[PDB]
């Protein structure tokens, strides 16, 4: 292969380890069909009394 | 008895559901002889740590 290696596709890659390498070697797809909702993003509380 | 015939009575009606219709009809004081001592009105706490 050259230049043209990925296919001008938009390239992601999986930096927190959630990729499982015996499942898929990459997942392509028309991202303007994928969509995350987010209702509360990561929030935090500060717990000094509870169990 | 096509007018008010409990004159010489102060009425209150039970509407909060506590009457016990089987218990009684009604029940007559002397609201003199009666009282109810409150050392403390409702308060509401929030509890978010509490078990």
């Known amino acids: 292969f050259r230049d043209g290696s990925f296919l ?18 990459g997942v392509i797809a028309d991202s303007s069909r994928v969509k995350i909702g ?6 935090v509380k500060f717990l000094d009394q509870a169990t």
Do not use: K
């Not at 001008?8 to 070697?25: D, E, I, L, M, Y």
């Not at 987010?38 to 929030?43: F, G, L, P």
């Open 8 to 25: 001008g596709f938009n390239t992601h890659f999986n930096r927190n380890g959630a990729w499982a390498p015996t499942s898929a070697v």
């Open 38 to 43: 987010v209702r509360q993003d990561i929030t």
